[PDB]
Design a protein around this ligand. Sequence first.
Ligand SMILES: *Cc1cc2c(cc1C)nc1c(=O)[nH]c(=O)nc-1n2C[C@H](O)[C@H](O)[C@H](O)COP(=O)(O)OP(=O)(O)OC[C@H]1O[C@@H](n2cnc3c(N)ncnc32)[C@H](O)[C@@H]1O
Ligand code: HEM
Ligand SMILES: COc1[nH]c(=O)c(C(=O)[C@@H](C)C[C@H](C)[C@@H](Cl)CCl)c(O)c1OC
Ligand code: SF4
Ligand code: F3S
Ligand code: FES
Lengths: 138, 102, 239, 613
Amino acid sequence: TTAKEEMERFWNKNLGSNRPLSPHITIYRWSLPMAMSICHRGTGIALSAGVSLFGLSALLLPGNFESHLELVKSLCLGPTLIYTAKFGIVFPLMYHTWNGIRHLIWDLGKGLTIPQLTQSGVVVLILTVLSSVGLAAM
Amino acid sequence: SSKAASLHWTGERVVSVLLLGLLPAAYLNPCSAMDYSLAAALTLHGHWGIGQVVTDYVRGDALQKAAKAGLLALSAFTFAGLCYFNYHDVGICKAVAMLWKL
Amino acid sequence: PRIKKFAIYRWDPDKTGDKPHMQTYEIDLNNCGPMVLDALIKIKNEIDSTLTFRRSCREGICGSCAMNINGGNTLACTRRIDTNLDKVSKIYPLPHMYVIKDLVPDLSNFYAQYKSIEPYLKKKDESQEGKQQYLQSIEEREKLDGLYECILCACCSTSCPSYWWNGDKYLGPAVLMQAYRWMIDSRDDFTEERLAKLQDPFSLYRCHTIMNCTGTCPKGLNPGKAIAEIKKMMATYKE
Amino acid sequence: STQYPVVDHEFDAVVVGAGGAGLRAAFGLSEAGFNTACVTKLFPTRSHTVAAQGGINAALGNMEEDNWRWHFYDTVKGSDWLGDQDAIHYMTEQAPASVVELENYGMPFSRTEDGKIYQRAFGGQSLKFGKGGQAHRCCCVADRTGHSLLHTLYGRSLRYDTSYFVEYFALDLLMENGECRGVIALCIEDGSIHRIRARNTVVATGGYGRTYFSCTSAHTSTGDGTAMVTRAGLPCQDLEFVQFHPTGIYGAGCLITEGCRGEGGILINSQGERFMERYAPVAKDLASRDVVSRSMTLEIREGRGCGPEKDHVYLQLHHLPPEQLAVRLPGISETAMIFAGVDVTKEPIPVLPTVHYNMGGIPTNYKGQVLRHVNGQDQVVPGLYACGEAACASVHGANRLGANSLLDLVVFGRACALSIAESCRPGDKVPSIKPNAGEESVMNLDKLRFANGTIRTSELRLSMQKSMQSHAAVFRVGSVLQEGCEKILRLYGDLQHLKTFDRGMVWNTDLVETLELQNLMLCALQTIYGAEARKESRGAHAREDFKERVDEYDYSKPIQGQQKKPFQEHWRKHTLSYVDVKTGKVSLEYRPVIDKTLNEADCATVPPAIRSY
Ligand SMILES: *Cc1cc2c(cc1C)nc1c(=O)[nH]c(=O)nc-1n2C[C@H](O)[C@H](O)[C@H](O)COP(=O)(O)OP(=O)(O)OC[C@H]1O[C@@H](n2cnc3c(N)ncnc32)[C@H](O)[C@@H]1O
Ligand code: HEM
Ligand SMILES: COc1[nH]c(=O)c(C(=O)[C@@H](C)C[C@H](C)[C@@H](Cl)CCl)c(O)c1OC
Ligand code: SF4
Ligand code: F3S
Ligand code: FES
């Protein structure tokens, strides 16, 4: 019996059985690292969606960009709202940016010990807020 | 044996460090060329990233090939769109600067 | 008297209709050993004997009693019951695995995966073996520390969310760390073709350094880190 | 019959047990080109052998320069001359060959400046036949040798086409006309029943510490093979001889290794004196596993207790360098902290002597061939083998020398294989079987499964354990031994009364733990009866009433002008215990220990002497 044959058996036995699946997310308690990975995906997906919705609209929709900014001024410049709409565009970007560096440092093999990990996590979190508030005000 | 999977993985980080090198390069030097290299780095890194999500969640035979095909479509249309926007409009860097001082 | 509530996952594959649910137990702590296993064993011997689970060394070195206690994967004989009588201990089977009965998971895939990485020394010249002790310097030996101590809990991989969604094709941290364990064994002549076995999207590359494995390890081991070294090796190894 | 599915299997060899020994025998068999089933109630890696800490002995001479014959001497001397020299010779002789083979498999032994295997000082081991000071020959993987040993053997076994019957509880042996045909086994997974039949059957089940209330051994050490044998009418050997490891936590009874004492550690009693110097001066606190514990256990009766209720003693590791504790003994730094809450570097450990090892077991050749006792004479049981803690070749005798059972495992694993490999060919006639053979076990299975008695399984288990704990303890008199026998005997009756609650086929642990209990009770019955009968003080079996060590001679004075005692007048012989499973009655005879070696010219026979360290 080879390892590949053991696996084949495993699946055919279980998928053709009345056995349930022991709960996972529903019961596995949440650690800051684990939540900080979902967010990387959350942000990563949204950012790609944004970019795509910018390139596609540059191909399908009428008018040029200047023709759109003047169009944006509908209920127009309301500082503490057009800042708020601006912030929430940079926020996912800055997070994914900062956490990206953390992922990159990891790939080098550095900072992968439980303490170090919940430290750099905070440093990425704090850095997001600063560079997010900082940019939306530039 | 070909070392494909690992080579792919290497590229992923090369573009990741390439894209990090470009967001300050864009701000400190907004221009014609930067607009394109930014579009190129942006569309690849995203294409591989979504690819990694798909080849994680999209379970099955038929659907895996489907999602991957439709993603190549979204990417092609994205990179080409951003290129069109560069050549025929203000160009990413200038669009950002306009969108911003507003 | 000091009473502690115990909410535990239950499933009898031998009673028709009955499907997954929790059962609550109550145990005086002056009559019970400090560990959650002690508790389990106690209710098994005193209250209800349908309570079915795996156990052996009660020392936290055999890896039999692996389970999800209060939302994290450890060993029941190594975890101590929170003396806090104002909480109810939630006891669960190792997450996202087929429940055979109650807290007993089907690990046969887990094992089969271990088999496929060939966890044994491999010499290009097996013709001289068993007659001379192989030389390995204490330095070369230190590279195994933190690796060889794995017990095969399945706390590890059964905390990895990639192993949840892709457990069939992704080996998961436990198994992976052991493949690493054999790459850096200086006595092993098969260091290169051991990496070639991971050259596909799922074997190794479903890892995204979520770090739930290292976090959850009952023995304080670091599979995630060891994985990163594999990933590096995969990108650097010649030919 | 209508209730249970019978599923038969055909092999060359069955190995019952995937511990250290089982495994070695298993793949060893497959390696010689044998189609080998390996039946085991736990996944291999869980087998107790993991728990092993100290190490494995081999006279490789890696520290000083050694000679396996000195290791021969030390084992036989420590065996208290109940050790069968033929087997002891074979083991020590084969020791360096076996340990080198394991390191070649890939066991990550800790290393020396040379880059060779690290050897350690241990209890009872000498140079130049007991005159050359402390011998450093315990080969070890830091603190976790048994772990690494089991894992590599398991690991190595995957390479061969060994048929693993994982989490299958063996019930009995399939026996026909005195010959063994295989095993009848319950498959835990689905409740099914599997008659695995082969030409040769190796029993490698390990010990039965779980007969006692306080033991180092795992919850699954239930001498199941030992029972299986006495259910087939075969004898068990020397079952009274139960080793009380000196060190282990007061509460849960976890093992703190002897490697603590062999690395410079000390034992401290209530007043503070290193009491292991007023009890045994010659070899100090690194003496026999039975002399040290005897010193401790009586010291507790002396009033010299060291706890909340003065019922245990200390093992101190304060004085050792911190840098050496984390490197040489890492797995006790954790477990002392985890179970007791002890930082090993600046605190002592609360250690009581607790049950640890079973020297007794299935009577055995140096070849591993299970013995029966027909007409005061030995006789090979055809197609039946035993190795390791389950077995008794009595390479250990009246007292196991520390760091030898791991070696015992490996050597007599190998041996059981070669014995088959050299007594037949693979693909030879697998003997046929009665259509309804093993009928008895399934019937016993059903009675225990739907058992609605009055005594709960756990309570009966408890009464046995504590009865053994107080009647057949370290020290034991014929007064309290006698009461213990008829108290155990009543508790064997009580098995007809027991209550089990789970009625399922899938993972009925409620059912198996009860089968474990019968398996235990049989091992208990022979332990207490053999103990009451033995009216001498040899090795671990020390009688208060018979402190004398009764040899064939009076071995203190010269052996010359003095006549041999008749067999049935000395106690330098092995105990052979039987039990009529129904009435639960222990009848016991004796067989002479082997004194000759395998080559007087290569390894001299060592005659009995006054024994003390
Ligand atoms: C108890 C103990 C012993 C020990 C030790 C620490 C502890 C806590 N430390 C040691 C050390 O440091 N150095 C050393 O030399 N020895 C040490 N020992 C003693 C030694 O480890 C034991 O004698 C040895 O482990 C016994 O090995 P063996 O292979 O003979 O038995 P096992 O390892 O306990 O494995 C049992 C296997 O048999 C299967 N089994 C049992 N019953 C059944 C049934 N009914 N059906 C099917 N299979 C069965 C188990 O599944 C297991 O595989
Ligand atoms: C220069 C700043 C950025 C850096 C340094 C960076 C870095 C990274 C890295 C290293 C990963 C993979 C880590 C892992 O999960 O294993 C990743 C994931 C991803 N990124 Fe980026 N990124 C950046 C900006 C962006 C942008 C602008 C987009 C949008 C186009 C984007 C979209 C994604 C996506 C879709 C993923 C995959 C999600 C997943 O599977 O986890 N990233 N990023
Ligand atoms: C980076 O990869 C990942 N990181 C994760 O934290 C992760 C998870 O945490 C999962 C338990 C589920 C979570 C809600 C996902 Cl669906 C939102 Cl992103 C998950 O599923 C995942 O994909 C494999
Ligand atoms: S590495 Fe740690 S968590 Fe993973 S299986 Fe081994 S002991 Fe368990
Ligand atoms: S839980 Fe996970 S995805 Fe990688 S870092 Fe650990 S295996
Ligand atoms: S039973 Fe051995 S680890 Fe809990």
